[PDB]
Symmetry: D2
Subunit: 388 residues, 4 copies
């Protein structure tokens, strides 16, 4: 045993500065680096290609995920973009979950429409759906678990071992739980990627991505493609994101305490028809989440009884949940998928995906449990006062 994940994140680049013995590593904004005399390139030459502040974050995420190295991108979508370009070429097929992130679907549909690769859509929680995708010999399979907004759990070990038997690489989008709560490379995944925008940064003030490869050689291909495509991130953003990472463990202990309390209030409340939260014993994939995850996390959804009118009343005076997109911040957020995250779909597509007009998504922050519960009770009470 090296150290734990909390210790490694908390101590990422403390005692890393050879210049001054600075406890927090200096921010290397510099675009360029001098040669050490004629013909002698130093370790760094140009920030698009390699930068020490960015590489510390890379190395800290590689260490938390258990991989050979990390590449840091300017956005989470850029991390997805990077994998598509390093791994696929025309004639290859990519398998995508039916309920993957809408930005992931938009990018996959736009590039497949040009013939960059072919798409197969699959429900990775249905054995026959997976088996039919894999019988086509795909190059790459994407897993996103838990799914958003219904928190479907995909069985990592099942999917990854079946993919390997037909020679497919697997990439897991581990954004929702972070490396502190789920380690897809422990199950044999080739790649794991994140939007650092979310939990890893935690403070809603950086947009970023990361890809971690299990194998050193795929890592080197990602470095080369990130440099060639211009997808690397800002050193300043890497600085703020490493700062946020240091409290990821301390933040998640409170996030998950709050989510367990909120799930208790919402589950079986008279105004709530269903709760989507892997913590609940009646959630499909509960047992699988209890084994492949180190906690149930702090995202959940619930269907409020009554109309769009009950929703408008619920959301109307919330004091401690901000109506917004994104998630994983220290501040609690609420989103209405039908008018926000899934507004571009038709009504008919939403009913097929199992997204109701009554569905609300919570990103539970680290405010005091007592306040979040008072706020939700007064929201459920405003909603109840519609109803005719």
């Amino acid at each position: 045993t090296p150290c734990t994940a909390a210790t490694a994140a908390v101590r990422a680049g403390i005692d890393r500065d050879t210049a001054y013995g600075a406890v927090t590593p200096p921010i290397v904004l510099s675009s360029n680096f001098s040669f050490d005399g004629f013909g002698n390139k130093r370790q760094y030459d140009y920030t698009r290609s390699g930068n020490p502040t960015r590489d510390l974050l890379g190395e800290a995420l590689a260490e938390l995920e258990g991989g050979a190295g990390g590449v840091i991108t300017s956005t989470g979508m850029g991390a997805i973009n990077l994998v598509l370009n390093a791994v696929l070429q025309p004639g290859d097929t990519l398998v995508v979950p039916h309920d993957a992130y809408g930005g992931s679907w938009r990018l996959f549909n736009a590039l497949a429409k040009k013939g960059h690769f072919a798409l197969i859509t699959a429900d990775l929680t249905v054995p026959r759906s997976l088996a039919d995708a894999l019988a086509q010999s795909p190059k790459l399979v994407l897993i996103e678990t838990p799914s958003n907004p219904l928190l479907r759990i995909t069985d990592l070990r099942f999917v990854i071992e079946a993919a390997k038997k037909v020679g497919a690489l697997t990439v897991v989008d581990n954004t929702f739980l972070s490396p502190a709560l789920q380690k897809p490379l422990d199950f044999g995944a080739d790649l794991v990627l994140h939007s650092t925008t979310k939990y890893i940064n935690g403070h809603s003030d950086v947009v970023g991505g990361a890809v971690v490869a299990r194998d050193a050689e795929l890592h080197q291909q990602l470095v080369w493609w990130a440099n060639a495509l211009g997808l690397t991130g800002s050193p300043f953003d890497a600085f703020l994101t490493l700062r946020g990472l240091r409290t990821l463990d301390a933040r998640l202990r409170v996030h998950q305490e709050n989510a367990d309390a909120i799930a208790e209030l919402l589950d079986g409340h008279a105004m709530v028809n269903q709760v989507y939260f892997p913590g609940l014993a009646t959630h499909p994939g509960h047992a699988l989440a209890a084994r492949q995850q180190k906690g149930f996390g702090a995202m959940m959804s619930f269907e409020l009884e009554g109309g769009e009118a009950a929703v408008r009343a619920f959301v109307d005076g919330l004091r401690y949940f901000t109506l917004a997109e994104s998630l994983g911040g220290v501040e609690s957020l609420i989103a209405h998928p039908a008018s926000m995250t899934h507004a571009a779909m038709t009504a008919e597509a939403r009913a097929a995906a199992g997204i109701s007009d009554g569905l609300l998504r919570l990103s539970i922050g680290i405010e005091s449990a007592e306040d979040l519960l008072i706020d939700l009770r007064a929201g459920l009470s405003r909603a109840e006062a519609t109803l005719t």
Copy 2:
């Protein structure tokens, strides 16, 4: 009304009128336009007032229960600000005998020039207090707990006795932060912090704050901070407010680690004494359980053996950085005889109860088991020099 943790977490949030930004925009601007001829806006010049700095001021004022907050470039600056706003020649200041060494350096320099007269007292000894208060001081400074032996002063007792002779009280609440101690609750006039320590928590800002209970004292601190040029950078205030949002989340881990470490060290064969207010045997325990919401994560202990034992302890620590400061997410160790108190005599240090075997821990938020493994290996290395 919301809890202190909810107020700290939501201090920035959905307060941007330009764009609805969730996180408040950073206002670096030194200057602001007039709204046409003769119409000053709320802000005109960053030295005097700045919205990013005022957000941190307001957050700290809300957490301490005060009427407003002033943000200074350093903690020493915050102490400087109080001395200039409150004292003038002829007035006397009462200071704790074991106050922070930076506070003592400033008090001595300004007293030696006659800005005010100084009385040093042991505020935990009622006779030493009553003798200082009988000299009608204008201002009494309290620093509790003390650094590095964690002496506890009775806030309600000193504040009432100060108030009975017409003195103001100022509490330096750096060590515990507003999340673990609230000196304005007991009637203190002023509370100040080095935000360098727990409030920022990430070892990347040096800063201070002053919160006044009364609106009229707050207005006097704002005028003096502007006139002396003691106000902080808005970037620093942005990073400090960012740190503040996790203060509560961090202190829960810090305190869990500190409880586990105190239990390893207390009565260990290589440890002669642990200074930690959480121990029932520590003088100040009961007072600390009453006036603090937890016992914190600073402690000191006396290692048996030399300086030789201290050198072997420190050589090879993987998870404690040997450095000054405290209150960061990363565990630190310091040796007062060679670091914080090295600028003293052997017998001045012996007079203050500071041995060559004393080590101070600032316990961070790493996993307890890693920190306990690291400390048990330091104690085996020290045993072995014996």
Copy 3:
């Protein structure tokens, strides 16, 4: 309107509805609140749109004369964004033979996969252009001046010929900036920059930008940049706009220094050739005097005495840093055979006209007198190696 200097200098000022801040607040926020149920504001998510980023986009669109700008995390991302917005399999792209090596690496990697076909051309040779355009390409890339031999491509010639066959044109305007060359005034569809170079000017941001002449292609670039995740950091936009405000003031000194240095080097017994569009003997001088507002501050020269003369020249330089990149306030030198073009074989370098004697200067804003004393002592060192 107002001039380009005025528009760049004033691109921040009086834009803050919240406080009237003279310099615009840094909007770091990843997200923005809905105004209430069902009411998205102007901004929702920084990957798609951010006000600090859009101010820089708008300032660059205004300097280039375009409908709008997109800001990328790097210059290569800007090239990437254009390739994805404009091309698909079956389309062909025309590329200059001497284009930037990062551009060539990206075009070759994506062409090897069938994303599009490549035609290489010498756009200074009418027949090389005519033969590319007779294939009906979808897009023509122009990079003028070229690096490191400062070849000038005739914008009006290339653009009017591309338009007759229905090709779109994109110009990489990195070397001169919008202050010195406006490709959209000649009819180009797109102009792009590495903002890492002159626009930022302080060597502390990597970034790119694309400006479209037409509102409809602008809207396509916005959509692809969002979908591909190529948009830049708000903080980087803030520093880049800060740099832009001095672009005019910087370029006046850059170009005075470069005229002075060109005068020393073109003379000189130790210099076989100077590549600088300001010299009357440089091929394309007259064309550069008409399509550019100045000759700029990049140049190359061939030092007599091959590699040993180069090592002695470069060895004690005090005011030129041996490094890649360009467009900084600080003077840089690079040796293309061992630095920018090291990955080519000796035979490809000889075919591209890149000698072992070739040195490239990125001339800064240091005093002309200092840069000349430094270059004269480099030329003595070199001569002492014969």
Copy 4:
């Protein structure tokens, strides 16, 4: 050879990173630094007391001013504060100019009123007023040249020599011109200080100060006091200030070209009764300014005919001059001292100081001269339509 001042500012901390060879110096935000094993303090231990990013800026300004070192403070007022605490004690007297910066005056009056030192105000341009202050044996003499907003010039060599004859230290507030246009240590001053908020930073996004001492022993006393009073600045601010410093020389060339064009429009214009600008041969101080300054700067004030109604019509449609306090940024600003900088004063106190209701102050930025002249010509027509 040494290099010029422009070359030193441009190349300040270029290729000085020992960790990576970074061209641009890494920003050291760290509050604390590790000991190199038991009992081995590194060069840096605690950012309040010493930080390498702040020390880079210190050293650059010391090199430009020709001094032994620099201290960087959180504000310019802080830099003045630092000098008062390092140099004076009760019983000492301070001589200040009658038209010093209003913040300097507020601080001098507050600390004098408490008895930190005695205080004498003198007109340092009038030899009798100077000789009477110096005969009272002051410890310290403050010079501010040029003055704001009437651009009065004090003879640096003359006041410094006379201060030295009676044993007084001199401190020059060199904010207005910056080290690029005036070097008070060349004439024998002990101290020079700046608000870096103004020209040195140049981009209106940092408030800061600096103090440079000629002698290494006074520099070490300013370092000790700055640490003890907690007056030191943010390393991020120092990074942004050093960034701005790199263009100071390039900016001032444009500022000065614009100021020369604007002075020529305003001087003898039908709507202008007087221009205060040391570049004019008619300005009292012109010859002194040509001798002790490398250029005439880019601050000026002028008296508009027609009082307050003319001023309101003048400022109403200005497109390229922002109505605001501060100065020395890349963007042109205008201020009206009677309603802005001197609004605190009374009408009789402002009349006494020569500040009319018609006085406008320009901070001329680096926009194209022709845009600034068109804007000012249209303000002068709007003022003239008043009347």
